[PDB]
Design a binder for this molecule. Structure first.
Ligand SMILES: OC[C@H]1O[C@@H](O)[C@H](O)[C@@H]1O
Ligand SMILES: OC[C@H]1O[C@@H](O)[C@H](O)[C@@H]1O
Ligand SMILES: OC[C@H]1O[C@@H](O)[C@H](O)[C@@H]1O
Ligand SMILES: OC[C@H]1O[C@@H](O)[C@H](O)[C@@H]1O
Ligand SMILES: [Ca+2]
Ligand SMILES: [Ca+2]
Ligand SMILES: [Ca+2]
Ligand SMILES: [Ca+2]
Lengths: 302, 302, 302, 302
């Protein structure tokens, strides 16, 4: 029958690109559209990068649209192409002549079943969709994000990059009443790709496994990591094999006003507030299992 | 030739309704659509009220769409129909099968010239349009709002109602780079309709002038007002006869974080900041001239 | 209140252009869109001509779309710009990024009341609308055409030009079950503009009355006419002042198969068939009254 | 990579339904939409039948739209549900809120590559698409029809049913300049399913192979057939395995005017006219190979 319908919103970005690769190697998922957010790079670059990845993967049938050019209430800060390392093809196809929100809305309207949204850059497009289309909330099964940290941030002391870029958009997502699943730094810093794992991917032997290895190569070349955290593919991996993860439901609030804490995801892990949980927070992963999943799925491109 | 194209976004609301009446009596203006915001009443009620007013005025040709159901990042607070007083007709037509933002976007796309947006409730729809359609900013001539106060607020000590309902949306408007014109309480509290003026409107003698009088009657039945301030029609009046007003260009910022000041419009009247002006702020009005304008235009419905 | 909503489909064409002028000088009518058919000239030229006329008339607010590039089942035959004579402005605006049928459909969907279609070239676009949008038939009040002849044709012995170009499309219109009103050659050959009438239009003295005179000049420079028949404006004139015309309801069939009669409108004037009437056929006009109407309306452009 | 994109337009109809089954069991094909034509049954029934088949097959992700309610220029004639025999599920999903032509156009616009149209009922929707969207012809790779007969007809002496229902639409398709491939009665009368073949399908053992057998059962219960011709699946079979067929390129004209020959496909097999070929005409099939293909593909539903 039909697969699980998903909308992927992202800002490639090496790990976003690997998330695309993993999703497209997974027949359990039906990627309905890919839209670009601005974060890792400027909106022109993230859009171009989605197109190049879909060109590489011979999935020009998936509609693409460029999203918001900046955060809701803040100027854009960025992380020279945004996908440096491998030689990638020029796009062989054009994005749709609409915005990301328009393409997401069209998908939700057209759909006969609730759609899962996966957003692995700043939450700007997702927030705009939620606020502008209250009539389509019933068509959203859940929103699976890469962003936030119960613990320390990777951009400012308290904040992870994606949330920091657009804290207001993230807060809108968490306040929306739609189930939210969060792959924060607590899980992604455990999802490390060691040099031996990149070697393993390279040894798979096909052009896509090679490109994935090259993407991983370039990024790697105080945190105390053995290998590089591979953040965005944790969202897709969780959809495919949730048994690889430990996840808890807690209340999460995004700080938008603090002097020293803008963009922090405040997670009420110990039930200190009266707040009902609004998110599933990933807190652990079987790292070898995660690597095994990526390696197995890369055989799709043989 | 063609008139000045406008998009009217509002939350009727007695003064919003009078603003509709004034706009539709003015051949210099071409009202392209009317959309409803939530503020004065719930979104179902403000939508119904737009429809009832257009039914009354025999302008069922103007497309109508309901907007956002709540503020961007806040729960809705409201000011039992929202237009109490006169007996109004049930709607004879349906709203468009799209959202307010969709209808605004379609208008801007279709337009051969920049369109003036007039927004007299909370700025929620306008902000969603600005953020979701960066490609359409060049199609927006200016945004004329009723909201804010250089001086004291009418809802909280520092904040006027429309801005207070959605401070984030108002801030997005003021930060947008599109010319903004503000009819705040500084001007609207001067735009008082005295009992003698309502008598004058009633003496015009047609069904619409009568309804306007009834709307004014009901609202009237510490501020030190002689008559009731008629806020929202100041936006339309400024478009028709700017010579009735004194306006200055200053920097305006909307407070979104303060303990005691959320929703305040902070106006740098005395050039104390380094900030370049982003708004035209109305600070005075020829009150009798404003009343004369309304009375003259009401003859349209003879 | 609101005016009579119309969709104008045409192939300018000097008389089509004069029909546009007359319609836009008439506040009783609300021209919702103008679309171009191919007939008098190629589809690129008729589209350009609509745009030039709307530019001249300062009505760039009326949306324009190009229609079908050829007849349904036949190659295009045409009557070097298609509006030769006057110097006309280059367009200052673009057509909509949709087809004529799409623009007509959007209009009908958006409308709160049945819309009158006026089609003064071949019926190609109208037929495509009727067949492709059966759900919108209830939104069409009537279809007013310029085309056909109860008597002799002006293109082949039995056929008038517009019907001859696309007989199948015309037959679809007449078979549609929507009220059809026909300004055929029986009426239009009586609607002659004499040299003295063109002088009168020229003496009105404004740039548009001058252009109309120039259009009439050029066309004029066996039929036994005193002046040139002004065909297409008879449709608009009938909407404005039906009392200027004598019209009868009869059955009309369009010949699509005959050896010698393709494109003939067969009118059962004497009730010789069992067929129920499907059209209002204009058979007479008060010519001076028609000229008076045009001259009076041209004062609009003073 | 991505599969071959197709638009399926059909009027189920037992063989149309089997064509849907075959297409959805074939990963080489990406069915972008299914639209309904009127022919075998009324338009309400063919639409319902598409929905029931997609419900059965768990492919509610494929968008569906109802098409034209009657032939272009003729009243509808039909072949009590239109899919009698098996118990089928009620639809679990709704058709799109647009017409067939609108859905086809949207698909063609959105597509990054030319799309193959397969039409197995009357050509009404396809013709409307071709005439109304000349700008999208370059997005149509080819049109594969079931219809016509080089030899004798199955509805009137000279005409096959699908062409007879709408000869004008078929003629528009053949005149369009887009490559046309025709599975006429010459091939479909050879594509017979014997009782032993239905037994074989039934022995495959899954719910879908069972339903296919039931559909074949009911239809069977002067022509000189051993088994029932299975017409519409020949189009899909030709796309999957053209080596099963013998096909020739010849000129084909559809008769629309004849006294005794309306709806005939006139095939210039012996090059007697000066006309350049406009169609690929299927003239032979490896019947056992065709049955083998259906049986192999039915294993998809195990
Ligand atoms: O902080 C993690 C995020 O930063 C970006 O660099 C990655 O794409 C990821 O989504
Ligand atoms: O505070 C003024 C605003 O409050 C509302 O009651 C009016 O409609 C006006 O827009
Ligand atoms: O035959 C009359 C028609 O021919 C065209 O030349 C005119 O525009 C008119 O519509
Ligand atoms: O004549 C063959 C056609 O008739 C219909 O009954 C079938 O579905 C097929 O498409
Ligand atoms: Ca990312
Ligand atoms: Ca208001
Ligand atoms: Ca004409
Ligand atoms: Ca069929």
């Amino acid at each position: 029958g039909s697969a699980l319908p998903i909308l992927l919103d992202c800002d490639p970005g090496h790990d976003d690109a690997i998330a695309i690769v993993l999703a497209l190697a997974s027949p359990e998922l039906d990627v309905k559209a890919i839209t670009s957010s601005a974060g890792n790079q400027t909106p022109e670059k993230t859009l171009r990068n989605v197109l190049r990845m879909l060109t590489l993967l011979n999935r020009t049938d998936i509609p693409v649209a460029g999203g918001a050019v900046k955060p809701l209430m803040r100027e854009l800060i960025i992380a020279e192409s945004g996908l440096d390392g491998p030689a990638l093809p020029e796009p062989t196809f054009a994005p749709q002549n609409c915005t990301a929100v328009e393409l997401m809305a069209k998908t939700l309207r057209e759909s006969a079943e609730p759609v899962t949204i996966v957003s692995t850059g700043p939450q700007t497009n997702v927030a705009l969709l939620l606020n502008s289309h209250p009539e389509l909330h019933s068509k959203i099964a859940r929103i699976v994000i890469m962003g936030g940290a119960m613990g320390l941030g990777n951009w400012t002391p308290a904040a992870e990059f994606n949330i920091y870029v657009d804290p207001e958009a993230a807060e809108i997502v968490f306040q929306s009443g739609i189930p939210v699943v969060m792959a924060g730094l607590d899980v992604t810093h455990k999802a490390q790709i060691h040099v031996e794992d990149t070697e393993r991917f390279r040894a798979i032997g096909n052009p896509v496994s090679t490109i994935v290895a090259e993407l991983l190569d370039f990024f790697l070349e105080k945190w105390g990591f053995v290998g590089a955290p591979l953040h965005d593919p944790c969202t897709i991996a969780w959809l495919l094999k949730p048994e690889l993860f430990t996840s808890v439901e807690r209340w999460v609030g995004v700080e938008t006003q603090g002097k020293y804490t803008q963009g922090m995801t405040v997670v009420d892990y110990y039930y200190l507030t009266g707040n009902k949980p609004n998110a599933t927070v990933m807190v652990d992963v079987d790292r070898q299992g995660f690597v095994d999943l990526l390696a197995d799925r890369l055989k799709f491109y043989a």
